[PDB]
Structure formats: structure tokens, C-alpha cells
């Protein structure tokens, strides 16, 4: 058994994740897991833990539709695509581009809406100082993904785990990467198991690992209409002026703005728009003023 | 388990920090911690460890007000800002500018007055020779900040921690930076956790790491009025001449002077003004005059 | 495990330095040190190791007086300077100027006669190939300097230690310098701890690192009176003829002439004045003629 | 490597053979790595007597280097009579700075660290600085020590921000250990170079005694020719060494050695041909010159 | 019940060693031994087992004399040294240095000529998988050494038995080392019991164990005169040509050679010198050819 | 006894090897063994298990002769070498060099022709997860090698065992190496026991272990004549065309080829020559085809 994951809170988290998985998939109750796979179970992300929905992603509607029709529907609905063997889901999916464009939000929406079991694994859980523990951890990760047959394995910042191999790499790290390469695509074919990765450095990933991510989505910087959609999504459920507000000017004048930059701009604009409301409530501890174009003009450069 | 948290002095420091945190926040007694989180607990900076007040900072009054209204109140008073989802605290805060302008001063004031639990982590504690211990250290730091729900993780000199990723980066360093990037903004959203960093080289920070510091404060070189306020703050509770001392001359003639430079100038002026009293004591302090400050100023 | 000690000679040196520190300051016997702090302990210079005092430095009398009144008395006498918040010792001290002007011996006299526990770190001990050990070494150094509360950390040739940070800098060195800047002036204030450096390239020092050295002493090339004082200091307990010796002329003829060069000139004058005496030993007082013979 | 450890054992054996008191001295691993670069008088075949044309320079070098470092008891009356911290042998190339270093290593017999930049330089982080520290510590342990760095202008070049990090830190550590607070014993580092101006002033101060081994004069060239042409048959009537010395104008020691070697080979060429199947004269010397 | 030495041959060896000890010391017949002490008795080195004499060690005459005057005579002749309490033998002796210099030769000479009962214990005879057996083995070893009152306990390669303690040490190893420390120098003072140890890595030994070895002997690499003495000892009772052999030249040109290296060189030189005699004996010249210098030069790098 | 000797087929193998040893040496009937010695018995290589003859090794005739007169004859014929005490067999033999040059062939020929009892033991059978079992295993290994008095303890890849000692070594591994050092050359002298090692990285062996291997054979890369002899002995009992096959050129162009490389080249050339005959045999020319230079050169680089 793995020496890590023996904590009482760890066991409680594993039991909680297993109960959630069994509640979502009743057929999962007949599946028995190893101790290593039970340790991997703590990295499962349920739909509940995610508050991001595909409707909360703006400016990526063609990308969202392509991701659905090429990733989610083949993986989650194999009966429709069973007519031809070339209609299967890809073994790997890579979301790459400049930071802040929505790769992590797309991964969150995949965790929430796809319906596939999701493992958001981090390298802290994979790495272990003891000999041979990391290889068994990856083996358990792949075996658990095979057991929860429609599974997605997510590795955020995948350019570090799947970095280019070299002689200067650590022996345990190199063996771990080789084991991941073998289990990803080897003699024993996986089931409906997909490894989804998000990264900013596309060229830092090993060629043998980039080959295992054949479906690549370029979440690039948003355009003017894309920025308008992102701003409309961010400024949803937030009151805006019916006459003075002009979202087109904000979308056009945010040249070279990522989604996170637009989120910070919206947060700042809402803060200085409601400053009067926080001033009133701080004395106690009316209504928040609808957002105006001018509030965006002060914190933008024209 | 972890490494370097097993020393008796280290365990005593962890127990002291946990006791201070529980005393400050009585609801924190029910929180249980892993051994890695206990190791991170030695990096906790409590308000009693900081002697620096927000009123002890001069020349940054609009910066202090903006930092308050956009950082502290959304983080520490979510009930006021709960009406709208866009009124939340920033994911990260960067205090960047020329050295000596008061970035560490603002960080100390945040550690003392914000009321947020504060972790001042240094990369000596994060780094570990053993394999995979540093990634677990990062994960423990983030989980501890999540448990102490209004937490601020402070990383002084964040340009080295968040350096731009390269193919020549060390494998442990690169995996550590990727793990910090994932936990900073990933699938599992953090609570009221904000990472505050101070740096002189903002360009050395990675673009994806500058992404996670969306609220940026430029603590630039002080102006004439800013120098006036800084020198007035430094010379507080220190005797000054009523008629023979003029401070506007010192503020105007200290062109291109940071707060540290003004502190050193004030220290030298006090030293060679009270040298006579020091010589008498070695065997009252004279009021400070503007002639003394002109003596120590090259102009 | 710092991997820098763990040797019989290293452990013996560390125990010797700790015994000397406890003998100098009896209050240190209750202080417990970590393994990394014990590794740092080997770089500690006790006053008995230094054979140079303040009376062996000449031509820099107002620099010695200013260094005393601005470094030693604020640091070693807190009760005298406790009246005002602007009378504390500096967080850093920089000795800069042309080489051979008297900065290394000034640091020697600081290690000998100031009274503070003295740490003369060389970058080789700090530079460790293993991951994260250099930063732990720096942290242990700062914690040990805080434990021995009156302390001075000396970095000779601080220009390369505190060089300007760049993208071409190694990752371990960049984190080392960042950790040094954090512990030098960060959230956790140091005690009576200051960092003193002697260098010849002040411009090579990083601006943020130069900021942490606010009390900067400029040791320039000596003047005529300064060179005369240096020659008088270098010629003590030696035979000088009353009528023949003219030290003033030797002082003026040494234009642009450093203290190390003054030592070299004095040692060459002694050599070619006592050549006959040492030849008789194997088998003449110092005058202006022999000094001007070596000079040009 | 096995060969490196064998070389270290070789040098250690030779040094304890010369100095019986060195058996109790313990060495660090980096100290043994430095000891691998230590040369001995046995492998050097050049004597101070073989240094012709530099008699006044040889006498001054002896008086300022050999005796104050080998006889502390004679010079113990005055601290100013001690050996210098560094000695620089600068001048035009081919004048015999390297052979001066070999004669210094041989006749003095000191523990000679004839060390190079390649042995100091290492790819791993912090290795070169530890190498320099162990070099100076080993020089402190073997108290009669001279450290030689041939072509020291490249090693002690002017410091700049353009310099690489590792070599700049290396130069800073060498600067610290050359004259620092932990004062060395009878340790003296000697450099031979052709570009004295290329050496940093901070390193210039650390070689206070300098040696200008210059272009030989007519008498100096005659002494060089007389010294290097020993154990050779010369016809008394035919030979005229003064004319040969006066003919070579502006010729370095290396040029004189090459000219004499060419003349001797041309003289002995006939004999070699006969073996396969004559004394040296002024005509062969004058014919080679243009 | 020690569960070791239960075999018939081990019991026979124990009985033979006890008989030899009783023959050597007639007063030893009154001593009754426990079963664990009988198990320790298998490690007794009676001097007839050793063939090495002190004379058989060359180049260590000052070391041999110092070892005698400071180790053997204070231990074996306490009547002479009983005038002052500071003249007793040390509680431990460490022989350290590069391998092949003669530490085991000195230990063999001590086993053969000192006259002290010698126990050459090994880690296999100490370690036991059963609980608490190894500590009882060490206790029996110390009690037996006390019973055979002039005794020497030898632990070859002592850097492994007395390695530096750590929290990563095995429980039985840490308990064993603590028990050895307690019995070595504790409340109950030992008799004329000395723990002589030979090692190559003195720095690997624990500081608390190096303390219990206060008399340290450095058997370093031999010098030219020392190598000449070693070669003279090794080439004794061997035919060498008077006119042709030059031992001094071989001693100079065997630079950086340990005693074992010189032994191997002498063996190879004698082999290639006598090869003719072996070639003549295999057919079944005459007498063995006396060894000359060239037989050593051909096997030397020089 | 340990857990290794409790298996049924392991006990059968041990009984078979003991029967073979008694059949080869009739004096071995009276010798009895401990349980650990019986487990060591399973690592003993009988000469009939080896199909490699000293004549099967080509190009190493000077090395084979030197190995014989310096290693085998002193060990196997002590009556001939008993006139001089310096003619004994070395305590250790090291075969080092680039891989594929014939070190394992030399060890096989030593196992089959030398006549010594051969212990070719691997480190898995030495290592044990239990406390102190590895030390007892090596102690029984040396005791058994002493009982079968002419014995060879061969450890292939001797660099992994006998590696340079370090503080990062496992405690059981460190005690194992120390026990091997003590039994190899300690107080209790071994009989005609010699440890033969084969390795590629001679520098990885510890200095104290390299000392215990004084006789060293450098099996370097074959030269032109050496490669000619290796190809001649590899192409034995094989039909070769007298007129067309010129082995000298094939020996000339295999620059840098080891013995394994020449073996693979010969195998490929033989397969290419016999492809037609083998295809014909699968359907059932009718005779084998003599080898030619063209088949060897087509696999080679001119
Ligand atoms: N398409 C989008 N629509 C609305 N908001 C977005 C979009 N993309 C990004 N954001 C905002 O940016 C923030 C972070 O985005 P995200 O973490 O997905 O970036 P990323 O492209 O994955 O970069 P990184 O790989 O560095 O995390 C989110 O909190 C979100 O509010
Ligand atoms: N704005 C200010 N008002 C008053 N004092 C100041 C100010 N800025 C700096 N100082 C003085 O300078 C000292 C150090 O300042 P601080 O460490 O905050 O500089 P910094 O901007 O963080 O630069 P660095 O990041 O290089 O440390 C403080 O002790 C403080 O007394
Ligand atoms: N002011 C002085 N009085 C007497 N001797 C001096 C003086 N300055 C330098 N010296 C001589 O120089 C040596 C000390 O070196 P010094 O302190 O000059 O180095 P430095 O100025 O720090 O230059 P660097 O930074 O290159 O080390 C002593 O041996 C001493 O003889
Ligand atoms: N001083 C010596 N005189 C004669 N022979 C020696 C001497 N030292 C070593 N030898 C030869 O070396 C062989 C083994 O030496 P020994 O085992 O004593 O080495 P060691 O120093 O104990 O190294 P290790 O601890 O690795 O065994 C002996 O058989 C002996 O022939
Ligand atoms: N001299 C030789 N004559 C004939 N065949 C040889 C010779 N040397 C090697 N070979 C062939 O090489 C093969 C490999 O065995 P070999 O003895 O070369 O291993 P080795 O040299 O010890 O290399 P390693 O160290 O990798 O085991 C053998 O099957 C043998 O057929
Ligand atoms: Mg992301
Ligand atoms: Mg700061
Ligand atoms: Mg200096
Ligand atoms: Mg031994
Ligand atoms: Mg005790
Ligand atoms: Mg093999």
C-alpha cells in the first residue's frame, strides 16, 4: 500500500469522492479498488465542486462546439459513434495558448457538464520520495480511470509533467514519464479513458507526449467580438446602465486583453462603481449603482 | 512525512504560531492539520510579530486607500461585498516598483492590520532536496491558506519564485512552479486566499504568473510631497526645532530619493546631531535643525 | 543535513568556534543551533584570529571615527542610543573604492575590536550544488546572526555576491539573492544584525542590494598626509635614521599610490636595507635614499 | 577516476617524502582534487643555472622570494622582511617567464601548485568556488607553498558585468582568499603573463612585487647563447659568439633557442644521413638569419 | 535460547574454542557461560588460527612500537602499570587509513602475539531477525569478554557497525548501537576489555563511537622506506639474486602503492620468474630461479 | 534458515547441485552444511551447465594464457606452486572492459574448464528483506566456498555490489558490503577461495573492494587480428565458400565491433544466406548455402 494517503482526513476525502461517484454512477458500486487506486480517488473532481458551466465561457462558442462534437459526444455517447471505428474519442486532448484565455474554465466545464468521471491530478500527489511509489501511483491512476470507464484525467500545467526528456532528468521522474507514456498508449489499450491537458508552453511538452495529445485546441487571445462575449458573460447578473453603458467601446478598446485581464477590469469597475454602496454599508457594519461605460474608461487606456 | 518540520525548535515555533492563530481566531481550534501543513505553519506571521502600522507608512495615502478598498475590505468583509460576484477579493496582488519605496512596508502593514492570517513564505522553506517534497510543501501551503479561510500568502522577492519558465529550469523548480500555478488558479477554487508578492523586477515574473497577480500596485519613487510625508513620518516622536528646522527644503532637495534613503539620511542626521549627547552618556538631545540635514545632503 | 559539515575537521572547527563564542559571550550557552546553523558556525571569525587592530590602519582617521560612531557604538551600545528611533545601527555597511585603500584591514579591525560576533562568509560555503541547500544556508546564517544578537556578516568582494540580477543568472543563484534580500530586510525584522561588505565595483552591486547597504564608506586613494600616516604606521619598530630619513618626500613622491603599494615599497626598502644583515646571518637604518631607490 | 586518484596519491607521496611532517595533515576531497594539480621538482628539469641572461633578475628573485619564504628565522626581525603575497612575471612573450616558474619550482623545492583554469572550472554549481577554497586551504596546510597560474591575464582579467556568473564568482573568491580577514600563512601565488594591463587592478594589488622580464640586451643575449649551447662541440678558432649575439637584434629567448636548434640540426644533418646510409660555427648562425 | 549456534558443527566449534581457551588460561575452567555467551564463543580467535606475526608487518615499526607501549603492555601487564591509575589500557582502539596498508595485519598480529583472548565478531553473528536477540548477543559478547578478563573484541570494517546514528536507522540497529554504547562505557565498568576496530571510513563512525575509540592509529600509505621494508618482509624466505636484485629501485618506482599492491606485484613477479619451473614441473628447471629486478620492472608501470 | 531455501523446487535444485558436487569431488560426502549454506548451494554452477569451452573464445589467447598461469594453475595445482609461498592464487580477479569483449565467456570457460567449484551468485539471492539475513547469506557463501576448498565466487556485474561506499547507502547494504570485506580479507584466512568479478565500470568499484581484486584483466575492444580470430571461432562448424569468402576483409571493416557485434553480424549473414533454404524447408534449395563475403558485407558498412 502507498505510504501517502493514509491520513484520516485523506480517507474521509476518498470515501466522500467514492460516495459521490457511486451516486452519479450507480454501476460503480460493484467496482473494488486497490489501496493505491483509493489514494488516487482523492483527486477526483465531481460536478458539484465546480461552479463553472459551458454557458459561463464567452468568446469560445466555435471552440466549445468543436470540443463537444470531437471530445465529449464520442467519449460519453459511444453508441451513436459505434457505426465506424474512426469515430472514437481521442486518447488525449490538449488545451494550449496564452494564459487567461479560458483553458482552465474549459476544463472546469468539462468536469461539470461532460458527465465523465474527472481526475484532476496534481504532481504533488504523483511525486513520492519513496522508491517506486510514483510509478505505482500512475499505474493506479490509469487503472482507476479504466475502472470508471468514462473517465477524464486532467493535468493542469502539463508542460512540466510531460516535459521533454533528457539525461539530466531525475531517474524517478524519467521512469515516471516512461510509465505514463506506456499506460497512455501501449499494448493494453485503455477503455474510454482520455487525458486532457492545459498548458501555456506548447513547445515544452515532449514529442512522444504531444503525440499522445492528438486533439489540440488553441485557446488564443480573444478578438473584439470574443472580448465582447467575454465581457457580456462577466457582466452578467450585474446591473448596467440602460443608456450610458456601451459594451462595444470596452470590447474594442481592450486590445491585447486576456479573459483574466477582462475579469480584473470588470471587478475593478464594479468596485469603484459601488464604492458609494460600500461606504454606506461600512457605516452600518441602498442599491448598487448600475455599471457605466465611464467606470471602464477610467481603468482602461485609450 | 515532511522534512525540516521535525526539529524541536521548529515544532515549538509551529505550536507557538498555531496557539497565536487560535487565540486570534477562536473558530480555528476545530481545524485539524497534516504534518506538511504543520511544517508550513512555522511561516505564519502574526500581528504581534510586526511593529509596522499602516499609519507608520508615509507618502502612500492614496495607494494605501486603494489597497484597502480593493484588497482588504473585499477579503476581510465578504458580507458587505456579497451583493455582487464581481466585488470579490483579487486572486493575487503584486507590489512592484523601485526598491526602498515601501513595498515591504505595505506587506508588514497588511500582516498587522488586515486581520487576515498571514503566511510569509521564503523559498528556502519551499525548496527541498528530497524528491517531491517541495510540491507537497506548495500543496500544504495552499491547503493551510484555505483552512485559515481569510489568508494572505506573502512571497517577498516573488520575481525569483515566479521567474519566467525556461527549458533550462530545474525539474524540481519547474514542477514546483507548475504546482503553484495550478493551485493558484485551477479546477478547485480557493477560498478567501490571496497571494501577495513584492518585487523590484516585474518583467522577470512569468506572464502566466503575472496573470495570477491581476491587482498590481506601483510603489514608485516618491515625489516632493511624498518625500515630505515620508520624512515627517520618519521624524515622528523625535525632537525637532520649532523655528530653526525647515523640512520643505529637505523634501525638495532630496530628488530621486527612496524611503530607505530618507531613513538613512534621518538616521545620519540624528546621529551627528546627538553625537554630543552620546559622548556625554558614554562617560539632552538637541532639536534637529535643517542645517544638519543640509550637512549630510550632497545636493 | 547541510552536507557541508559532517566531516571531522569541519565539526572540530565548528566546536572550536562555538567554544570561543561561549567564552566571549557566556549568555550563548543556552542557545541551541540547528545543523545548518552549525554549518554556518565554521565561517565565524573570532577576534583572536585577527592580528590587525584599529591602530594598525593609518591615513583613514576620520573614516575610522565615522565608522566607529555610525556602526560600532549604535550596535554595541543600545542603551546609549535607545532614546530615539533614529539612532540604531545600519542594516548594512559598504566599504567601496579603489583596491588597496584599507577596506579589508578595516573589516579585520571590525572583527577584532568592535566586540560583535563576526561571520565572514565566503560564497563557496554558501554555493551548494544540491537543490535548496544554498537558501537554507542563507536562512541559517541570518538566524544564527540573530541568535548571536550583536553580529556582523562580512562578504568580502560583495560586488559578485550582490551583482545585478538578470535573466541569464542561474536559478539557484537568483533564489539565493532573493532569499538574501528577504532576510536582510523583510517582514521579520533582524535584531542587532548588519551585513558589511568590502568591494571595488560599487556599480556592479544590484540597486536593491545597494539599498540594503545605506551606510557607505568611500575609501579612496590616500592623500599626501594620508600616505605619510600610512608610511608611519607601516614603519613602526624599525630603525629610521634621525637626520637621513625624510618621510614627507617619500609621501609626496608616491603619487596615486595605494596602501598595498605603500606596504610593498616599505617591504622592498626593508629588504634592500637589511640585505647585508641577512647575508651576514646566512654566512643599516632605513633612510630616504633606499625608499627613493625603489621609487621612480 | 582511478587515474586522478593515482595522481593524487603520487603527489601526496612525493610531498610527504620531501616533508616528513605532512603525514599528520588531513586533506578534504576538494583538497585532494587540488593536490592532483601539484607539480614537484622531480618532473622539472630546468635549473636556475639554466636561466641564462637573467642573473640580476635571478638574484633579485632569490632575495625577494626564496629566502624570505624559506628562511623565516633570518627575516623574523621585521615583519616587512617577509615574502610578498604575490609575484608577477610580466614581459614580452618568449622571454622565459614559464621557464622562470619551472626553475622557481625546482630549486626552491616548495610545494608547487601549478594550477590551470581548466582544472578550476567545473560545470556543476559551486564546484569551482569550493575548488579555489580548497586550493587556498591546502596552500595554508603546506606552509612553504607557491601557487603558479600560467597565462594569468586570462584568469585575472578585468572584471565586468559582461563576465559570466561562475567565473566572476570564482574571481571574487580568489580575490577574497588572496588577501582577506583569514590571513594566509607563507602562501604566495605567482603569475606569469604577457599582458599586465589586462589584469584587474584589484588583482594587480595582490601581486605587489613585479618582475619585468624584458627583451634581452646584447650581453643578455650572449649569456643566453652561452648557457643554452652547453655540452656542444665548438671550434675555438672558428666560433665567434659575440658576433652571433650582436647579429640577433630584437630577438627573444624563444627566437634564440629556435635559431640555435636550427643551426645545430643543420650541423648534424650530414651525420644523420650517414647513419641512415662537425662542430657548430658562426656560418650556420649567420646563414639562418635573413 | 539464543537460536544461534544450535547446529552440531557450531556447537563443536564452540567446545573446541572453549577447550583452547581453557588450555591457554587454566583459571578459565571455573567460568560458567550462558547459551548466548556460548554462541559468542564461536567468534573466538585462538592464536594458532592466525599465522601472521608482528615481524610479518613491515614499514610500521614506529606504529607497532606505539601500539605495543600504549595498548598491549598496559592491558596484558597491569601489574607494571598499576602504580598510577592513568596508565591503564584504552577502552577502544581504532586502526584507520587507506585500504591495504596493514590494519588487518596489525589485528592478526594482535590476535597472535598480544596474549589477550581475541573475539573477531562480525555483523552476521550479531544481527538476528528475532526480536531482542541481537541486543542479548551484544550483552553476551561483553559479558564473555569480561569473563575472559584480558580480552580484545575486534570488529573489522567497524564503520558499518558504528555508523552515524539517524532517525532513518532500523529499530534493531539503533537499539543494538545503543546497547553497544551502554556496555562499552556505562555504569558497570568493564575489566581488561578493549574494542579494537579497523576501518577505512573513520568519518562514517559516530562521534559517540569515535569517543569510545580514544586511541587512534593512522595506517596511511607507505613511504619509500616503508615500502622498502614491506617489500623486504614480503620477499623474505624467497630466493633473490644477490647481484641482480635492486629492492631500493623497486621501492622508489612503486610510487603510491599500498602493502596489498606490493604483495600482488611480488606474487606476479615471482610467478613470471618461476613460470619456467612450473612448466618443467607440469611435464613431470631444477631449482627455482632467484628473483631479479627485471621481473619486477616488467610488472611495474615505472 | 532463511525463506529462500524453503521452496520445494529450490530444495530439489540444491539437492541436484550437491549430488553433482559430490560426483565431481568424492571427498565432499563427509562435508555437511548449514541451512544458509544450502540456500547458497542453489547458486553453484556445475561444469555441465556451461556449454562454453576455452577454445570457443577467440582473440584472447594471450589473455587466456595469462589468466591460466596466474589464476587457475596456482588455485588448482597447489602442489606445484607450494615450493614458494608467493605463488598462491590471487584473492580476487577482475575482468573489466567494454561490453561484449568476452568477460562472460571467460567466466563460463572458468566454470567449465578450470575445475574449481563455481559459485555464480546473483545479488537478488544475496539481498533479503529481513533483518541480518544478507550478512548470514554472505557468511554462508564464504563458509561454503571454504568447505569446497577449490572454489570461485563469481559475481557478474560486480559494480552494483561492491560499489563505492557512501552515507546514502542502505544500512543492510552497508553491513552487507562490510561483511563481504571482512570475509574476503580478514583475520580468518580463506582457503583456496577466490572471488572473480566481471564488470564494465571499474571506477564504480570501491577502492577497498578493488584492492581485494588484485589481478585485473582488461578485456578491451578487439583489434583487427583479434576480430579475425573471433570471427573464425564464431564461424566454426559452418560451411564457408573457399573461393569467395575472405575473412580478412570482414575482419578489417568491423572497426569498433565487439565480440557480441561480430556474433550478431554472423547471425544476420547466416540468416541471409540460409533464407532460401529455410523457405524451402518451410514448404516441406535442398541443401545449405556456403557463406560468402557479399552476405557479410551487405550487413556491414564498407
Ligand atoms: N472565455 C472566458 N469567458 C469569461 N471569463 C473568462 C474566459 N476566459 C478566462 N476568463 C476569466 O479568466 C480567469 C482565469 O481563466 P483561466 O484560468 O481559464 O485561464 P487559462 O487560459 O487557463 O490560463 P492558465 O493556463 O494560466 O490558467 C477566470 O476567473 C475567468 O473569470
Ligand atoms: N513610504 C515610506 N514611508 C516611510 N518610510 C519608508 C517608506 N518606504 C521605505 N521606508 C523606510 O525604508 C525601510 C525599508 O523599506 P522597504 O523594505 O519597505 O522597501 P521596499 O520598497 O520593500 O524595497 P525592497 O523590496 O528592495 O525591500 C523601512 O524600514 C522604512 O522605514
Ligand atoms: N590605510 C592603510 N594603512 C596601513 N596599511 C595599509 C592601508 N591600506 C592598505 N594597507 C596595506 O594593504 C593591506 C590590506 O589590504 P587592503 O585593506 O588595502 O585591501 P582593500 O583596500 O580592501 O582592497 P581589496 O578590495 O582589493 O581587497 C595590508 O597588508 C596593508 O599593509
Ligand atoms: N605493512 C605491511 N607489511 C607487509 N605486508 C603488508 C603490509 N600491509 C599490507 N600488507 C599485505 O596486504 C595484505 C592485506 O593487508 P590488510 O588486509 O592488512 O589491509 P588493510 O589496511 O586492513 O585494508 P582493509 O581494511 O581494506 O583490509 C596482506 O596479506 C599483506 O601481505
Ligand atoms: N572472444 C570471443 N569469441 C567469440 N565470441 C565472443 C567473444 N567475445 C564475445 N563473444 C560473444 O559475445 C556474447 C556476449 O558475451 P560476452 O562474454 O561478450 O559478455 P561481456 O563481454 O562480459 O559483456 P557484458 O559485460 O555486457 O556481459 C557471447 O555470446 C559471445 O558469443
Ligand atoms: Mg489555468
Ligand atoms: Mg522588501
Ligand atoms: Mg580585500
Ligand atoms: Mg581488513
Ligand atoms: Mg554513557
Ligand atoms: Mg556478462
Swiss-Prot record, chain D:
Observed effect of gene inactivation: Impaired transmembrane tail-anchored protein localization, characterized by mislocalization of PEX15 to the mitochondrion outer membrane.
Protein's UniProt keywords contain Membrane: yes
Effect of residue 52 to A: Does not impair ability to extract tail-anchored proteins from membranes. Does not affect formation of a homohexamer
Subcellular location: Mitochondrion outer membrane; Peroxisome membrane
Catalytic activity line of the entry: [protein]-with a C-terminal TM segment(out) + ATP + H2O = [protein]-with a C-terminal TM segment(in) + ADP + phosphate + H(+)
Gene Ontology MF, one: membrane protein dislocase activity
Keyword Transmembrane: yes
Extra information: Present with 3530 molecules/cell in log phase SD medium.
Task performed by this protein: Outer mitochondrial translocase required to remove mislocalized tail-anchored transmembrane proteins on mitochondria. Specifically recognizes and binds exposed hydrophobic surfaces of mistargeted tail-anchored transmembrane proteins. Acts as a dislocase that mediates the ATP-dependent extraction of mistargeted tail-anchored transmembrane proteins from the mitochondrion outer membrane. Able to unfold protein substrates by processive threading through its central pore.
Similarity comment text for this entry: Belongs to the AAA ATPase family. MSP1 subfamily.
Protein name: Outer mitochondrial transmembrane helix translocase
Species of origin: Saccharomyces cerevisiae (strain ATCC 204508 / S288c) (Baker's yeast)
High-level lineage: Eukaryota, Fungi, Dikarya, Ascomycota, Saccharomycotina
Primary gene name: MSP1
Residue window of the full protein shown: 43 to 349 of 362
Amino acid at each position: 500500500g502507498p505510504l501517502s494517503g493514509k491520513s484520516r482526513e485523506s480517507k474521509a476525502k476518498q470515501s466522500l469522492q467514492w460516495e459521490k461517484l457511486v451516486k452519479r454512477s450507480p454501476a460503480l458500486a460493484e467496482v473494488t479498488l486497490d489501496a493505491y487506486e483509493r489514494t488516487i480517488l482523492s483527486s477526483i473532481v465531481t460536478p458539484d465542486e465546480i461552479n463553472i458551466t459551458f454557458q459561463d465561457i464567452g468568446g469560445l462558442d466555435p471552440l466549445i462546439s468543436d470540443l463537444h462534437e470531437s471530445v465529449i459526444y464520442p467519449l460519453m455517447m459511444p453508441e451513436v459513434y459505434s457505426n465506424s471505428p474512426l469515430l472514437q474519442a481521442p486518447s488525449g486532448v490538449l488545451l494550449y495558448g496564452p494564459p487567461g484565455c479560458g483553458k482552465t474554465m474549459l476544463a472546469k466545464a468539462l468536469a461539470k457538464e461532460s458527465g465523465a468521471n474527472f481526475i484532476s491530478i496534481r504532481m504533488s500527489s504523483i511525486m513520492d520520495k519513496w522508491y517506486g511509489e510514483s510509478n505505482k501511483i500512475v499505474d493506479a491512476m490509469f487503472s482507476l480511470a479504466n475502472k470508471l470507464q468514462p473517465c477524464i484525467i486532467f493535468i493542469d500545467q502539463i508542460d512540466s509533467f510531460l516535459r521533454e526528456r533528457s539525461s539530466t532528468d531525475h531517474e524517478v521522474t524519467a521512469t515516471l514519464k516512461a510509465e505514463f507514456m506506456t499506460l497512455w498508449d501501449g499494448l493494453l489499450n485503455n477503455g474510454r479513458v482520455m487525458i486532457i491537458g492545459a498548458t501555456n508552453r506548447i513547445n515544452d511538452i515532449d514529442d512522444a507526449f504531444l503525440r499522445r495529445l492528438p486533439k489540440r485546441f488553441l485557446v488564443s487571445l480573444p478578438g473584439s467580438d470574443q472580448r465582447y462575449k467575454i465581457l457580456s458573460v462577466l457582466l452578467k447578473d450585474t446591473k448596467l446602465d440602460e443608456d450610458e453603458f456601451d459594451l462595444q467601446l470596452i470590447a474594442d478598446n481592450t486590445k491585447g486583453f486576456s479573459g483574466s485581464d477582462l475579469k480584473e477590469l470588470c471587478r475593478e469597475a464594479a468596485l469603484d462603481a459601488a464604492k458609494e454602496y460600500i461606504k454606506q454599508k461600512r457605516q452600518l457594519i441602498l442599491k448598487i449603482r448600475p455599471l457605466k461605460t465611464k467606470d471602464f474608461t477610467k481603468k482602461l487606456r485609450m
